[PDB]
Amino acid sequence: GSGKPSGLRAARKLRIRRRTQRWADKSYKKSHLGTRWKSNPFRGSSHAKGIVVEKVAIEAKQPNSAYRKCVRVQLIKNGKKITAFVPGDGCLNFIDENDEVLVSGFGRSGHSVGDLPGVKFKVVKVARVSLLALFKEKKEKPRS
Amino acid sequence: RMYGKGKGISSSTLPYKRKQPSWLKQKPSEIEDAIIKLAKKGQTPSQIGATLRDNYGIPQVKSVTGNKILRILRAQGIATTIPEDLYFLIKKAVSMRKHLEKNKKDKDCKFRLILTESKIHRISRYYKRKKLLPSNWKYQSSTASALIA
Amino acid sequence: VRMSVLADCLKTINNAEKRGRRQVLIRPSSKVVIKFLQYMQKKGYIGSFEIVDDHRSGKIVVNLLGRINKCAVISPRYDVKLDEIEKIITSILPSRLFGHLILTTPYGIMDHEEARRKHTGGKVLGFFF
RNA sequence: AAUAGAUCCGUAACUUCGGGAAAAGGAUUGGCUCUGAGGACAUUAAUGUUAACUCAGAACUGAAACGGACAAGGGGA
RNA sequence: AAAAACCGUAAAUCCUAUCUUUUAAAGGAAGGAGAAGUCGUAACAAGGUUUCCGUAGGUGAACCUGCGGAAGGAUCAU
RNA sequence: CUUUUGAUGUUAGGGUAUUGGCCUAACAUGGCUAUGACGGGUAACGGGGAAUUAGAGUUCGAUUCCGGAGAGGGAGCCUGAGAAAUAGCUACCACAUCUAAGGAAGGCAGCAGGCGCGUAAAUUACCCAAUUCUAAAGAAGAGAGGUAGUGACAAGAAAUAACAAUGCAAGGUUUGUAUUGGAAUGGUGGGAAUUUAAAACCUUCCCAGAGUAACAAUUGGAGGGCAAGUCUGGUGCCAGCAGCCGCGGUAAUUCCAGCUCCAAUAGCGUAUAUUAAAAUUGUUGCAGUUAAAACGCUCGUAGUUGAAUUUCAAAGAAUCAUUCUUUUUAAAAUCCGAUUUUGUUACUUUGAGUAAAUUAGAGUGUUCAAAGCAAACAGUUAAAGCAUUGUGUUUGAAUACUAUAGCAUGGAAUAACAAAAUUGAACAAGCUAAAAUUUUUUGUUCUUAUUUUGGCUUAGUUACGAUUAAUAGGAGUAGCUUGGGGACAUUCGUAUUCAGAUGUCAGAGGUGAAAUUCUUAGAUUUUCUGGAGACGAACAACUGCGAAAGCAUUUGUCUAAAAUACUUCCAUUAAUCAAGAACGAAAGUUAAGGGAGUGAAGACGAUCAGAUACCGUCGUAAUCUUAACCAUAAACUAUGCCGACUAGGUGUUGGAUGAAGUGCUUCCUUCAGUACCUUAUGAGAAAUCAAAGUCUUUGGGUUCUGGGGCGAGUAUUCGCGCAAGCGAGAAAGUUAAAAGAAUUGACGGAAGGGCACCACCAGGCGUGGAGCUUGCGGCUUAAUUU
């Protein structure tokens, strides 16, 4: 045998078995469990606007040694508190204590990225001014 | 094997010759008469064929007369209402139930009784799927003791 | 429980051929396996086989030419329309220059090529190459 | 002081599965005029004689009132 | 024509009950992560009492002990 | 679950445009459901379709078309052919406008537009010219619709040069390459033709109009994956980079910069989601001994799957040597030696209906292409065709798909179902009951009967009528068959222990030492007697039996099983199985009894730094029996069950067969168990495996289970339980490994060997004991340089 029914009239068992077993892998469970809307702060959105609460340095993992400059954001959709990493070298001091900031995922969906522990989001622009256009080169205007 | 293990291929294989053996000058009429008399004296068809082969020297009654022994037994109208195998299974179940009643600590006998009654139910389902056993026949375990008629 | 006699016959033939024993005994003969064998024979994959008839659904002894490299059954017997014959043969057969996929069709047992040539694909039986 | 009879409905936590329980909490109730159901007894499948109060339903009716007096649990955490 | 009554369609409000979702909380008890913290040495070697299972009791902790199992053993073996 | 309150049906009615529990009355108790009813969720309008696709598949579809629904939420209603209409009305709820305060008026999910919400989306523009609708129907309207505006949503085409000479490099006078220096051309500005409802855009024409053609291309990278620098400065575990592995502590190929290079290119990154990758959801097509994963075991219903057997065959024309086409050959009804149908379904073949858009696809130079459905041809202005002089001609807008279900249809194979015997037929003859025909009593009218045929009963005649008996299954029968299978009763043995007695006298137990403990009242020891509970050694095995757990004293009874033998019977009765059921070690629970030995707890004595442990003395529960629970074990061969096939040898258990050492025993063959060894051009990652093989040459049947690790067998709910707990069983968060097998090394309070006075043994001389010199540490060191 093979461990599975092979009858010409055994489609019901195969379909039921596949339907039940599909709940085993992480991907399908993650993408078909309604809990994700309740869990993730973005409610399935790719980006989110929020209000900066305060800046905070976060330790890197043990093999590394760095003080990553992140910020704590109160989202406008739900008022949820999240921590977002501020990319760039000197961009931390270029954001204010109560400025509005647009934030996106960190590139691994709900997973931490790199040596940064527990940070799943990165800011992309502050005071509707892009951090890339504000740090990589001042080709855009400075902070308003 | 239905229960347990072991293939146990022991059986009896009929000879290639399908006709009556040439030496046999016996006549089918007296063969059937003897089979009727022996069944009347009272024996199940299996042992009827057994004593027919052993004492009358007429192997494979189907060769001597062109049909089977239970078939002629029915055609005479004297065949029993419960088939051989079902009757023997019922008898064995009745005996082991009677033993269990006295010795209820015999878990092994309980297990074997369960197996025997499973066989009884399967066999009776088949026999009543055929028309040769009444549709309401059930074999409840209470009156089986006297069910042997 | 033997279920499919044809599956057992083809498995036994395949094993005997891999052993290269030049002669193989197939116990539970049937008309279906006989037709399958003589189709194999007509396509030249086996020699002259001979069925021995007891009164017990007799046996078959087939002469092997060491020339078939895989014969097998397909279970369950899927019903194949004429359209997807080409869909199934490129999945089963090693190549479309040789090899045969055996069908049972309203006009008898035949391979995919002549099933095409006379239309009316049917249920799938097996293959050999 | 608050209902409290009866009928119909509905009844939680907990539980030793027996209860809790009349839990809690709703509706109805008179009079009158009717309708339906529930038995017994003799004659040649059918016709007559005759009894009990008990339920159910419908109209109408009244200063919306009817367990009209009497009698008659307050519940819950 | 107003107006009224009665069946019917029936919005809406309130009471009660149940269900669903979200959420506060003294206290309790977990898990994960961090740091060079304290205490011991449980496992890996026969890990220094072979290890492990189920069950039961005990102890600061790893853990210990009883009963019955397994070798994934440290024995394929007079 | 539904069913008082219509649930299912009947009867009657009412109501409707019509049928209908649609509603009413009476009556009945029905209707749906593990093939998932009834509920719950959906960030669910359905479909035509979209993305991705080798084939399967997976995901999406608010959104051009079709169908549905709604107009803030409900309900009600008028007109009307058509509305439960909402730019119609009425009321309530929520909003909200004007008011002289009395009262009025509202519904952008129509087009614009505004606020709000947000990551997230355009002009309060023009016109009815095209498409089409309404009307009293050329002529009026239409935010339908069309046009333009905003528009890097997507999609297509396509600039940022090209060329000649020297100089340079390469080559036998050929390529690439810094100077010159003239051509070409758009972008752009202007005018126009044209287009258009008007305008704009496109196209076309004419003026201007490129050398640093300043008319300048960017985005992201340069350690690997992955194309491209160990170039130069800055920083120096900081800043930072980095999807992952990682880089960063003075040479940073990785950060920050410059140069250079790479990739894509008017586009290039980022985030989220989705598809392929993913054979990591596996029907095709996964894995389950050890990596995650075979239920403890068996029975068992639903489901899935199921031995063989009924008409085989023969003969003829045509391409290449074959291949391909045609005819008949049993039986019953149809046609005067001939005329013609002979289960059902699945399945398969053909058709019919297949809306378009989309898709595939035929044709067609939109300058190409995306497109679109058009178009093409002669014609400085006329031949020809046809019409009895004028009238252009030729066309294309195909075809396929449109479930799986439904309609029709050819069908031989494969599958099912039907019919088929303690009987069931058919035919012939006679008998009986109706029909057809004919004759016909008889005054707008009454008989009747005759002959043939469809049906009943009764003698006889048919080839009268039943497939094997599966190395499937079940039943049976036989053996001075087998077995530690089970239950009950019964018997024995020794040890231990208790009590009594017995003799003797200093110890006895125990440990690596010891101690706790017993002991002049006589311990330990010797011998005897009686009792008690337990257990059943040695025999005893890579042996037996059992579904597993498990089962070893004798005998008896009861009970079952298996194998073997069978020319015994039945004839598919079978395999595996969610639910469900029986059994289920030990421990544990309940209640009686038992209670020697051992002994979780506990108490001591030791060891140790500590020792609540290992060791020792004692010891409660338990262990045992009975009656109930519990339902779990590394319940393990970590390997589900049934079936087929594939190889030698050594055994061994139980039968059967044949022959021969001596009525007795061995050998041969064989069945069924049960192990082991070798072998694999078998498998596997390997260890290893005769199954874990016959698997990318993938399909015998079937059940269960698994999908990175931790969280976690946790939380919560339900069922079960006296309880302990058992069964079912998440999520958040966190994390780049965890895991399997094997190799080398290293290590081991692992085993076995070997060597050495930096080891020992025969030994001797010494140091450390004293005083002193000297080095180091340390002690306050402008410094006691290090």
Would you mind describing this structure in some detail?
- This is part of a larger assembly, with chains A (144 residues), B (149 residues) and C (129 residues).
- Chain A has 144 residues and is an alpha+beta fold.
- Chain A is built from 4 helices and 6 strands; from the N terminus they run H-H-H-E-E-E-E-E-E-H.
- The N and C termini of chain A lie far apart (73 Å).
- Chain B has 149 residues and is mainly α.
- In chain B, 56% of the residues lie in helices and 0% in strands.
- Chain B has 7 helices and no strands.
- With 129 residues, chain C is α+β, with helices and mostly antiparallel strands.
- A 4-stranded antiparallel β-sheet of chain C has the order 4-7-5-6. A 3-stranded antiparallel β-sheet of chain C has the order 1-3-2.
- The two termini of chain C are 28 Å apart.
- At the A-C interface, loops of A face loops of C.
- Chain B binds 3 RNA strands through helix 2, helix 3, helix 4, helix 5 and helix 6.
- Chain B: One of its GO terms (cellular component) is cytosolic small ribosomal subunit.
- Chain B: One of its GO terms (biological process) is translation.
Query: Order of strands in the sheet with the most strands of chain A?
Result: 1-2-3-5-4
Most extensive interface, chain pair and sizes? A-C, 3 and 4 residues
Number of helices of chain B: 7
Query: Number of folding domains of chain B?
Result: 2
Helix content of chain A: 10-25%
Shape verdict of chain A:
elongated
How far apart are the first and last residues' alpha carbons of chain B, in Å? 30 Å
In angstroms, what is the radius of gyration of chain A?
Answer: 22 Å
| Tally of helical segments of chain A | 4
N-to-C SSE series of chain B? HHHHHHH
Distance between the termini of chain A: 73 Å
Known CATH architecture of the largest domain in chain B: Orthogonal Bundle
- The Cα radius of gyration of chain B reads 19 Å
Order of helices and strands of chain A: HHHEEEEEEH
What is the CATH level 1 assignment of the largest domain in chain B?
Mainly Alpha
Please give the number of β-strands of chain B. Answer: 0
| Structural domains of chain A: how many | 1
Structural class, from secondary structure content of chain B? Answer: mainly alpha
CATH superfamily of the largest domain in chain B: S15/NS1, RNA-binding
Say what the CATH topology of the largest domain in chain B is.
Answer: Helix Hairpins
Largest sheet of chain A: 5 strands, mixed, barrel
PDB class: ribosome
Keywords: malaria, single particle
Entry title: Single particle CryoEM structure of the Pf80S ribosome in the unloaded state (nrt with E-site tRNA)
Chain A: 40S ribosomal protein S23
